[PDB]
Design a protein around this ligand. Structure first.
Ligand code: 1P6
Length: 287
């Protein structure tokens, strides 16, 4: 079913990454239409538009309880700019949600969120997609009991004959979530996503405390005097030498062990998302 641009009523800006807005799709013009989330490009050039259409095809191919729902696309006349229409997830970003309710979210709830992120990622892998940007900033909360992976802007499809994707000219790079091989060789795979997942687990159990964030902690370890390209250089050498993020205060042993397993320099030794979801669900059952 189609979405007429004239009937999308702006309500509120939700966030920037392009941008995401809260809109009411109101063709009856009586303010009773559905509230949706709309993603559009800030700078809709020819290369970005091509990348955005691929992102849209990726999201449309995905149907999982822990992946934000695709609703449709809005086309503009002439130049062919695109708006991606998604379900509105009313509790917002996990990052803000956890910052707002801090420790009032207990470990068993955090593990319910962990399990769901794991399941969404495992599914993504069966499609041979690499997310590349797994972080709490890309997770949304539908309700108290359900989170969803909510943005796929950096997602690549693996080539048929390879188990990695090599990025030739990197743009946006969340280096503090990157596996060593991604920093050194710009190589991305299911194993690099698992590394990133360990960082997500660190994020949840620090309750996204500002001074404990991955950027804060890694900068401390390499020295706050490191700048620009030198950060990447020193980060690589630190990770090669087993410098890791510390255990979050109050974090259960069995969860901290999962993080450190994800952060294995040896790509082949990192666990699979299938094995992670089983392990996490066993922890929850024990508790
Ligand atoms: C950058 C963007 N920021 C948002 C987004 C939303 C939001 C929402 N409430 N529902 N929804 C549905 C699809 C996309 N975004 C959303 N809420 C708050 N902040 C952002 C975009 C995707 C992410 F995964 C995270 C943040």
């Amino acid at each position: 079913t189609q979405f007429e641009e004239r009937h999308l009523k702006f309500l509120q800006q939700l966030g920037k990454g392009g941008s995401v807005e809260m809109c009411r799709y109101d063709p009856l013009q009586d303010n009773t239409g559905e509230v949706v989330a709309v993603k559009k490009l800030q700078h809709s050039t020819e290369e970005h538009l091509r990348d955005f259409e691929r992102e849209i095809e990726i999201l449309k191919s995905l149907q999982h309880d822990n992946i934000v729902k695709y609703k449709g696309v809005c086309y503009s006349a002439g130049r062919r700019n695109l708006k991606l229409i998604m379900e509105y997830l009313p509790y917002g970003s996990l990052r803000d949600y956890l910052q707002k309710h801090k420790e009032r979210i207990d470990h068993i709830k955090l593990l319910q969120y962990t399990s769901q992120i794991c399941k969404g990622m495992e599914y993504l892998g069966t499609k041979r997609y690499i997310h590349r940007d797994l972080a709490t900033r890309n997770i949304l909360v539908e309700n108290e009991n359900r989170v969803k992976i909510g943005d796929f802007g950096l997602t690549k499809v693996l080539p048929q004959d390879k188990e990695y994707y090599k990025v030739k000219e990197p743009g946006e790079s969340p280096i503090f979530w990157y596996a060593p091989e991604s920093l050194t060789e710009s190589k991305f795979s299911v194993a690099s996503d698992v590394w990133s997942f360990g960082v997500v687990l660190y994020e949840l159990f620090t309750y996204i405390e500002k001074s404990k964030s991955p950027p804060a902690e890694f900068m401390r370890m390499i020295g706050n005097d490191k700048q620009g390209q030198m950060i990447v250089f020193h980060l690589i050498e630190l990770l090669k030498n087993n410098g890791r993020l510390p255990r979050p205060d109050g974090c259960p042993d069995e969860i901290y062990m999962i993080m450190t397993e994800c952060w294995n320099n040896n790509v082949n030794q990192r666990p699979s998302f299938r094995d992670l979801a089983l392990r996490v669900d066993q922890i929850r059952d024990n508790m």
